[PDB]
Amino acid sequence: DKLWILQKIYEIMVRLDEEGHGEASLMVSDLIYEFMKRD
């Protein structure tokens, strides 16, 4: 379902920030926005 992949994408965003990859975390944030803008 959509909830598992949302959670996995969210987790990558968090992991990237904790590991210091802030810029790549912002890019994953944009994907979360786009994904949820879908139906």
Binding site for other proteins (CB under 8 A): 3, 6-7, 10, 13, 17, 20, 22-23, 25-26, 29-30, 32-33, 36-37
Give the shortest CB-30-to-other proteins separation in angstroms.
6
* Residue 38 backbone class (left: φ over 0; alpha: ψ -120 to 50; beta: rest): beta
Q: 19 by DSSP, 3-state: which?
A: coil
Give the shortest CB-29-to-other proteins separation in angstroms.
6
Q: Which of 8, 39, 14, 38 is nearest to 26 (CA)?
A: 14
Tell me whether residue 6 or residue 15 sits nearer to other proteins (CB atom): 6
